[PDB]
Structure 1
Amino acid sequence: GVGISTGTFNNQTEFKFLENGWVEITANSSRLVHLNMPESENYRRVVVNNMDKTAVNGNMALDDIHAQIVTPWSLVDANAWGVWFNPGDWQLIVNTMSELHLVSFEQEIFNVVLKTVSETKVYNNDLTASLMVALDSNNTMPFTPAAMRSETLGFYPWKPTIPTPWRYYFQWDRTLIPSHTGTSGTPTNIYHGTDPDDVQFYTIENSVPVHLLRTGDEFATGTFFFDCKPCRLTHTWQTNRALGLPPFLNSLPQSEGATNFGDIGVQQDKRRGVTQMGNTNYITEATIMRPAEVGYSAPYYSFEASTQGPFKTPIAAGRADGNPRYAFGRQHGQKTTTTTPERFTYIAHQDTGRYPEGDWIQNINFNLPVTNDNVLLPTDPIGGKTGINYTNIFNTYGPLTALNNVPPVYPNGQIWDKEFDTDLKPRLHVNAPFVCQNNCPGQLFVKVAPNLTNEYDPDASANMSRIVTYSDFWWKGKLVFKAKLRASHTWNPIQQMSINVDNQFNYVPSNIGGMKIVYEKSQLAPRKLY
């Protein structure tokens, strides 16, 4: 039956228990997708240049100057946590699971219907023309994750969704010499062009086979099989100070009380232990040797320039800097019945951060009540500039550094990302908990075919005459996870996530049918570093 569904709608989450505390989580997900025909049928090499805003001295960071190929195609990108889990299942997962494996993944298209408009507006069906669908199985096309722009499919199962109009960067070359407000003149700020060796113009038609779906047929993907390393849903709290055996106290407290601190019995120069300071006899918690370094200082709010203009240096961890800030819309968790983006900043429990105002370096001689000339504090002007202290230019990354992978972010966080095809590869990606080891799942590209009129000819310089057309189709996906149930090793309870009196009204809809999804922490429970 053409009017009867080619497949079944599903969003029900299936949990299944395996031996030894393993569990399989099949996040079934399905969304209705609305797709208008393209504004133009041609690929466009568009160049953006906001010289008006950048040219003022001190707006260096506002450089949006770039080039991109605007395509006639659109992308269906389900790579975000909110697409697959509602707050209940995410709450249960983060409260009951310790580890999380990304296992498998599939998609299909079903119940495609194609409509056209006539002229008041009269809407008509057209069973003869085709929707154009293609899946880049070989990962030939550039990987353009939509989670970064918050253009993934909508998290609400019941509303419609739209796919992102797809585009990819095209090589440009640019210089922007930095300047401050009050610089003596206009700095060098020009757009060079593009280089011939780096030109890359991809097209969907030449690269991937395009299926011409019509009503009564489907496109379905063979399920992709991941092999990523496990993410961990438990944070580690121990900095270098809390590593190893503590010192023994010769004076334990004689009575209960906040002010009744314990005391070490031995003088600081006469203690016993190991310190990585050849010329200093004082053994202290700051000076005692530790096995390695947890976290690292990096130059914060540092911008570095290359051929394609300046960009911010990413930092793997944070204490306000470092922590990620999202800005999302109505499809992705803003309060629906409101008429600017809604924002939050993930102050995660991961720790491994740094407190720049507490750092210092002192001279190798180590005259212990250190004089001014023998210590460089975060209050000192580097280069005469009072706002920039030494920690702005300071890097402590070394062979001894140990770091934790980034948290998952529900609902706006990306799930997976593509490993860079460079020879030497980064240790982690700061925008996804999983990184595809060799290949990610293919990107699904969609397009409404050209519905021409009788007036079309190719010689006309004007755009081809096309009948007003759109299409409506339902997307489905099945993401399989695998996870380990936690265990209560610790006597005291952990900070489980739960509904409380303040946050209760965020889960239920408003009287006028509006809804929101608030941001939810991921690594709740603590974990040993050692």
Structure 2
Amino acid sequence: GVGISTGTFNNQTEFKFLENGWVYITANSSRLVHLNMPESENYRRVVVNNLDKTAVNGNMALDDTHAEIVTPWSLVDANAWGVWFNPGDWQLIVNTMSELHLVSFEQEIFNVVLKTVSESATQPPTKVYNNDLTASLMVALDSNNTMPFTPAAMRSETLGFYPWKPTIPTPWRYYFQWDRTLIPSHTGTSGTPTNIYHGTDPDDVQFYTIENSVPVHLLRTGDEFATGTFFFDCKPCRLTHTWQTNRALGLPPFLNSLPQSEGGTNFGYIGVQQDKRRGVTQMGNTNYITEATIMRPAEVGYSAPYYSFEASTQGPFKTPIAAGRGGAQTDENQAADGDPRYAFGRQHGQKTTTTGETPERFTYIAHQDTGRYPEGDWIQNINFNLPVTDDNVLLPTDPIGGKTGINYTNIFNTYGPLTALNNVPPVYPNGQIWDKEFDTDLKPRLHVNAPFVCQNNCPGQLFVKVAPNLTNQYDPDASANMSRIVTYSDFWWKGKLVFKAKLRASHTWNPIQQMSINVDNQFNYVPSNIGGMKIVYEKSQLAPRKLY
């Protein structure tokens, strides 16, 4: 009833160890959530069109043109690592365990409170907030996944990462179909290259509403709502990175001359003529058997186009890339390798004391060396007459299609039936945790936004919305918009995410990569003179593995 709580705050993370090193990580999370009434109780199809920026020529990549359905509903998305673990937790997981399975996920909503503003009372005149006991909070759980999947981690619009700091849901919205053509161009280009929003393919129209698809719960103060326990089914995510590229797969060539004094240029030598050597290559011509030549069982990683933009029905988009990291010391071509870049705000990691609308950012560079350094690419002629003539080799220097700033690697693609890959490493704390699978008849071998993909069925999205609190004058027949009592709600959310992981073991003489502090770094993990605070990017696949 009124004065009786209906839930329990728990943001506690339990690590329960079982036999043969299987661990049962139960991550609990709770937040106080704040929510205002919708800006209007109506669904809207709104179009965005920045001809102002796209008509610029050379500005094709800046297109924001799209269509959108704006709903009076808000989304409670908890899909982000930062919602579930603090650094202390993350340290434990990443340093001590080898893989990670996703087991179960449940959530509930409790201690609902609804208050009406209204306002105006009295002298200078100040505003006042009272309880509406009989008012309701609408909650709807789309467990059938009827509605478009909108993971909020992509827009850094998930729940807060701090337990003691309140948070908010995000206004729900989804893509509505639109046709669109935009021809690329450069600064030099004459005329106005065609740039139009043609409209909407009627055969492709889908207008969704919460009301017609999902059962809606009305919660007053004393009511509570809990979901079931959802059980996942996916592959394991691994917490070890592979370091080997093709150049280090298998049996190294025998050294007939070993160095006999320590030092930095005291190299060893194979000691056999490069053309008088034994082994297997895929070069039918020469008898040269060298490390860049000698056969390897397959190919680790692949080359991809960058920055490739492709275009379909609804406009242009970047061609996404899988692997990374690929370069040597401190130089990686963060685009040929498609290293992801995260932007986020105060609620999700940025220093909470920082004023101004500029977001904090970082680029995740993985530890797993499976990418490319296209500067080192080249292509020789069939004949392999070397030292090679300029006429017989194509370099990443030699311009393509007569452009000084373009070479073959920009359109290059070496994905093939010998390609080997890893799945994306987890990005703490801004990374997405799980993601729905495309309902295409054929599916991607992975996603770049999250390591766990539900081919089964994913948890339904959870939607909240303040119920219309009407005044006494209401005419629905009237064109003038609805006068509603100003109302808002505070409610508590508790979720439970269960993982099952396995402890790693030492198999090498040497120690290995592990997180810690650090006389540097040490200060990203405590509050400040004022109320803190900051959560920092921190990797995930620290311990080495082994491909082959």
Give CA-to-partner distance per residue, 1:296-320, whole Å, 9 cap, x none.
0001101001010000000002347
Structure 2 counterparts to residues 70-109 of structure 1, below 5 A: 70-109=70-109
Give CA-to-partner distance per residue, 1:182-207, whole Å, 9 cap, x none.
10111000100001100000000000
**How far 1:514 sits from its partner (Å)?**
1.8
**How far 1:2 sits from its partner (Å)?**
2.7
Inter-partner Cα distance in structure 1 for 2:466 and 2:190:
54
TM-score (norm 2): 0.96
Inter-partner Cα distance in structure 1 for 2:273 and 2:285:
18
**How far 1:217 sits from its partner (Å)?**
1.2
Give CA-to-partner distance per residue, 1:148-178, whole Å, 9 cap, x none.
0000000000011000100000000000000
Inter-partner Cα distance in structure 2 for 1:207 and 1:59:
40
SS at match of 1:477: strand
Q: Does 1:400 align with 2:385?
A: no
**How far 1:321 sits from its partner (Å)?**
5.0
**How far 1:280 sits from its partner (Å)?**
1.2
SS at match of 1:98: strand
SS at match of 1:270: coil
2:407 to 361, 381, 389: 389
- Matched with 1:263 is 269
Inter-partner Cα distance in structure 1 for 2:237 and 2:482:
50
Contact kept, 8 Å, 2:116 with 2:486, in 1: the verdict is yes
Inter-partner Cα distance in structure 1 for 2:54 and 2:140:
39
Contact kept, 8 Å, 2:322 with 2:337, in 1: the verdict is no
**How far 1:486 sits from its partner (Å)?**
0.5
Contact kept, 8 Å, 2:182 with 2:194, in 1: the verdict is yes
**How far 1:438 sits from its partner (Å)?**
1.7
Contact kept, 8 Å, 2:337 with 2:371, in 1: the verdict is no
Inter-partner Cα distance in structure 2 for 1:129 and 1:507:
41
Give CA-to-partner distance per residue, 1:316-348, whole Å, 9 cap, x none.
023475110000001000000010000000111
Q: Which runs of 4+ in 1 moved over 2 A?
A: 1-4, 318-321
Contact kept, 8 Å, 2:435 with 2:450, in 1: the verdict is yes
SS at match of 1:206: helix
Structure 1: where are the runs of 5+ without partners?
none
Contact kept, 8 Å, 2:301 with 2:421, in 1: the verdict is yes
- Matched with 2:332 is none
Give CA-to-partner distance per residue, 1:3-48, whole Å, 9 cap, x none.
2321110011011011110000000100000000000000000000
- Matched with 1:9 is 9
Inter-partner Cα distance in structure 1 for 2:449 and 2:118:
45
**How far 1:391 sits from its partner (Å)?**
0.2
- The more displaced of 453-462 and 443-452 is 453-462
Q: Does 1:324 align with 2:330?
A: no
Inter-partner Cα distance in structure 2 for 1:286 and 1:351:
17
Give CA-to-partner distance per residue, 1:365-390, whole Å, 9 cap, x none.
11021101000000001000010000
Contact kept, 8 Å, 2:337 with 2:372, in 1: the verdict is no
SS at match of 1:481: strand
SS at match of 1:283: coil
- The more displaced of 414-423 and 316-325 is 316-325
**How far 1:350 sits from its partner (Å)?**
1.6
Inter-partner Cα distance in structure 1 for 2:381 and 2:514:
46
Structure 2 counterparts to residues 294-309 of structure 1, below 5 A: 294-309=300-315
Inter-partner Cα distance in structure 1 for 2:48 and 2:294:
55
Inter-partner Cα distance in structure 1 for 2:2 and 2:101:
39
Structure 2 counterparts to residues 277-316 of structure 1, below 5 A: 277-316=283-322
Q: 1:155 to 1:129 in 2, by over 3 A?
A: same
Q: Does 1:380 align with 2:386?
A: no
1:235 to 228, 241, 248: 241
Inter-partner Cα distance in structure 1 for 2:279 and 2:42:
72
Contact kept, 8 Å, 2:101 with 2:237, in 1: the verdict is yes
Inter-partner Cα distance in structure 1 for 2:324 and 2:313:
28
Q: How many residues are treated as equivalent by the alignment?
A: 530
SS at match of 1:147: helix
Give CA-to-partner distance per residue, 1:224-255, whole Å, 9 cap, x none.
00011000000000000000100001001111
**How far 1:351 sits from its partner (Å)?**
1.6
Contact kept, 8 Å, 2:74 with 2:170, in 1: the verdict is yes
SS at match of 1:331: helix
**How far 1:437 sits from its partner (Å)?**
1.6
SS at match of 1:227: coil
Inter-partner Cα distance in structure 2 for 1:14 and 1:428:
30
SS at match of 2:129: strand
Structure 2: where are the runs of 5+ without partners?
120-125, 326-335
Identity of aligned residues (%): 98
Give CA-to-partner distance per residue, 1:412-451, whole Å, 9 cap, x none.
0000000111101110011101000221111000000000
Inter-partner Cα distance in structure 1 for 2:273 and 2:40:
80
**How far 1:264 sits from its partner (Å)?**
0.8
Give CA-to-partner distance per residue, 1:65-110, whole Å, 9 cap, x none.
0000000000000000000000000011101110000110000001
Inter-partner Cα distance in structure 2 for 1:511 and 1:3:
37
SS at match of 1:192: strand
Inter-partner Cα distance in structure 1 for 2:484 and 2:82:
37
Inter-partner Cα distance in structure 1 for 2:71 and 2:258:
72
**How far 1:279 sits from its partner (Å)?**
1.1
**How far 1:146 sits from its partner (Å)?**
0.2
Give CA-to-partner distance per residue, 1:113-155, whole Å, 9 cap, x none.
0000122211110111210000001100100000000000000
Contact kept, 8 Å, 2:399 with 2:407, in 1: the verdict is yes
TM-score (norm 1): 0.99
Inter-partner Cα distance in structure 2 for 1:224 and 1:271:
60
- The more displaced of 461-470 and 2-11 is 2-11
Q: Does 1:368 align with 2:366?
A: no
Inter-partner Cα distance in structure 2 for 1:318 and 1:92:
25
Inter-partner Cα distance in structure 2 for 1:458 and 1:316:
53
Inter-partner Cα distance in structure 2 for 1:2 and 1:454:
25
Inter-partner Cα distance in structure 1 for 2:61 and 2:286:
45
Q: CA RMSD in A?
A: 0.8
Inter-partner Cα distance in structure 2 for 1:117 and 1:25:
42
- Matched with 1:527 is 545
